[PDB]
């Protein structure tokens, strides 16, 4: 079993991912670390604790992270995407399970130091906790096995505005710290995940399936689906976070390109992710020079990824 | 005959374009306006005057433009792409023809005001003179028939650094003024022009042809081709400026997408061009909201464009 920490802002697609992850036999979830984005950090913690209970694992530690980005200020949340409670307005009763005392940043540092080169991190929201752990401990990047990030828009439009994807826009400084940390990083941009969908028919197939969490997953996805229709004009949902989980277990369902990634932190392009492919010899040095390259998902085998996601969601 | 002003920084591909333009029948070149970029403004004026003489038209007015970008400061020139003299180190004797007294900005306003909705502008370098014209006369944008711009990198890597294309990076503030002016604008990015090449074999075919300027064009192209081999790893040249001239006469050899274009003026992404395609309904307003969209070249019919360029370059 491969040790995994999920850094997340649940979140409708985050919740689908977490529930899938608990059903994956090759994976050992050693903890959930929470962040803002789809909902405030407190709302993310509440949902993560509820997901642990729903999965029959209330013993799995939940470590609350940062309430704001590194630059500060109360963050704007995607409630128009994920609902007021972050899970499509189900307004569920409060969990009995409680979060651990330590912060998400401290939990990440402790578990990575406890098991060097063994713990993988799946980043599903803004990268604040991951950046805090990199800054607080300089050996973190050498001790973490792999960091799989759902974030960015590589040579494609963003989803917050034309320039930026939501997770990166949520904390641009944190994303730039993570992408230049020298750790073994895999980034999956929305240029990849918007190709991997569940249509209205696929969602109905989920409702009618014998899946353990089928009824709950369908109720959540109703609000998520309606946003895609109003904004993207698509009758269904984009599987952003489940696709990044698929890259953890089955990287062979994708192709990757190596290259230095930088994040714009100011101006009209705040949150924009840009990769230097290294196929052109520049005349002079630039902000992409001297850093260690990372892996950027380039193509996706959509039927294989959809088959893997559907089998986990529809498992009894 | 359609009236045309060429705003240019000659420049090797600029020189190919200017010489093609003088041979093109459905066009009347009413003037050349010069700018920095490939070489300093004074060097661009010298080359433009030499091109008018070589074409047998020393009477065609040459109006010298801005020596530095809108924000000020001595500009960095692409002498590693176009040579010390701006024309591949041919070190030709000085022209006998002299430039006009008025600035490029004043010439642009005067000729567009003289013939409202008749004069087209082909922009081959940084957009400083065009922006100065828009700022000095706020009706300029509405009076120019069309502005065809060679510039930007749309959902592709830049050629200065991963973020920016050279002409836009030369004056980001000027490009942003032009793209938001409300004028009838057609932008041709390097995402289009890098698909339209002359290989080493094609250049040899040009040398062996009966073309009026074949010998001169080939000598000048030697330094230009060499940069492509050292930097891009391509044995030949990218026809950037001749392709934008092809978009003036034959826009039917391309497909275009309508959308608001903004330019980043600060940070690591200074000079980055980004278009909002308008295919997604945004939840809130952004820097792309409220402006008039422009036409962005999306695809190119490479054989048709190559055929048109080759027939002009190889005409006796
Ligand atoms: O349209 C959207 N706007 C903002 N955030 C999201 C999300 C969330 N943010 C990430 C994708 O931007 C992903 O992790 C998901 O949990 C999905 N769709 C949208
Ligand atoms: O590789 C390059 N770096 C900088 N400028 C140029 C140019 C010039 N600048 C424009 C394309 O960036 C184009 O108008 C041309 O005259 C060609 N190739 C390069
Ligand atoms: Ca998420
Ligand atoms: Ca030029």
- Containing A238, the helix (H) or strand (E) segment is strand A236-238
Residues in chain A: 316
| In contact, B73 and B27? CB cutoff 8 Å | no
What is the per-residue DSSP string for B233-252? Answer: --SEEE-HHHHHHHHHH-GG
Structure tokens at B232: 């891009």
Q: Is A79 labeled as ligand-binding?
A: no
Structure tokens at A214: 């089928």
Residues 6+ apart with CB under 8 A from B28: B1, B2, B3, B4
Nearest to A232 among B163, B262, B280 (CB): B280
Structure tokens at B249: 């006469």
Q: Is A268 on the interface with B (CB under 8 A)?
A: yes
Q: Is B100 on the interface with A (CB under 8 A)?
A: no
In the block, residue with structure tokens 């960091």: A147
Q: How many helices (H) and strands (E) does chain A have?
A: 13, 11
In the block, residue with structure tokens 């900005």: B105
Query: Which method was used?
Result: X-ray
- Containing B102, the helix (H) or strand (E) segment is none
Q: Is the CB of B18 under 6 A from ligand 2?
A: no
C-alpha triplet B120, B125, B126: angle, nearest 5°: 105
* Residue A212 C-beta-side C-alpha neighbours within 13 Å: 14
Judge: A277–B156 Cβ closer than 8 Å, yes or no. Answer: no
Chain B residues with CB-CB distance to A179 below 8 A = none
Instruction: Name residue B187's beta-bridge partners.
Output: B149, B296
| CA–CA gap between residue B150 and residue B123 (Å, rounded) | 6
Longest dimension (CA), chain B: 61
| CA–CA gap between residue B246 and residue B237 (Å, rounded) | 16
Distances (CA, A) of B131 to B116, B174, B272: 18, 5, 17
Q: State the CB neighbour count (10 A cutoff) for residue B275.
A: 24
Resolution in A: 2.2
| CA–CA gap between residue A190 and residue A231 (Å, rounded) | 15
Question: For residue B243, which ligand has an atom nearest its CA?
Answer: 2
Q: State the CB neighbour count (10 A cutoff) for residue B197.
A: 16
Q: Which SS3 state, helix, strand or coil, does residue B255 take?
A: strand
Cα–ligand 1 centroid distance for A166 (angstroms): 6
* Residue A67 C-beta-side C-alpha neighbours within 13 Å: 3
Q: Measure the CA dihedral B14/B16/B17/B20, to 10°.
A: 160
Tell which residue, B314, B168, B188, B191, has the closest CA to residue B249: B188
Judge: A279–B233 Cβ closer than 8 Å, yes or no. Answer: yes
Q: Cα A245 to the chain's mean position, in Å?
A: 8
| CA–CA gap between residue A148 and residue A122 (Å, rounded) | 5
Tell which residue, A61, A67, A64, A73, has the closest CA to residue A34: A64
Q: Cα A80 to the chain's mean position, in Å?
A: 18
Instruction: Name residue A297's beta-bridge partners.
Output: A256
| In contact, A247 and A150? CB cutoff 8 Å | no
Residues in chain B: 316
Instruction: Name residue A299's beta-bridge partners.
Output: A255
């Amino acid at each position: 079993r491969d040790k995994l920490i999920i850094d997340t802002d649940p979140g409708i697609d985050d919740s689908m991912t977490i529930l899938m992850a608990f059903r994956a036999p090759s994976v050992e979830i050693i903890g959930l670390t929470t962040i803002f984005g789809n909902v405030d950090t407190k709302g993310a913690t509440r949902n993560a604790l509820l997901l642990c209970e729903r999965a029959g694992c209330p013993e799995v530690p939940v470590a609350e992270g940062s309430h704001e980005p590194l630059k500060g200020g109360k963050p704007r949340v995607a409630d128009f995407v994920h609902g007021s409670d972050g899970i499509g307005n189900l307004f569920l009763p409060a969990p009995s399970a409680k979060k651990v005392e330590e912060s998400a940043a401290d939990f990440l540092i402790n578990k990575v130091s406890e098991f060097p080169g063994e713990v993988s991190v799946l980043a599903l929201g803004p990268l604040t906790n991951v950046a805090l752990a990199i800054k607080r401990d300089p050996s973190f990047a050498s001790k973490v096995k792999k960091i799989v990030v759902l974030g960015g828009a590589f040579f494609a439009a963003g989803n917050v505005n034309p320039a930026a994807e939501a997770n990166i826009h949520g904390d641009p400084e944190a994303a730039d710290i993570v992408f230049t940390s020298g750790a073994d990083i895999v980034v999956v941009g929305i240029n990849i995940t918007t190709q991997v969908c569940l249509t209205d028919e696929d969602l109905l197939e989920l409702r009618n399936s014998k899946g353990k969490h089928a009824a709950f997953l369908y109720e959540m996805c109703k609000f998520y689906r309606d946003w895609h229709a109003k904004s993207d004009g698509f009758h269904g949902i984009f599987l952003h976070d489940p696709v990044s989980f698929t890259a953890v277990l089955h990287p062979e369902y994708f192709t990757f390109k190596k290259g230095v990634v930088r994040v714009e932190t100011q101006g009209i392009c705040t949150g924009h992710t840009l990769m230097d492919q290294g196929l052109k010899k520049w005349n002079s040095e630039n902000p992409w020079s001297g850093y260690k390259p990372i892996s950027v998902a380039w193509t996706v085998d959509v039927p294989k990824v959809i088959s893997f996601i559907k089998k986990l969601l529809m498992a009894p």
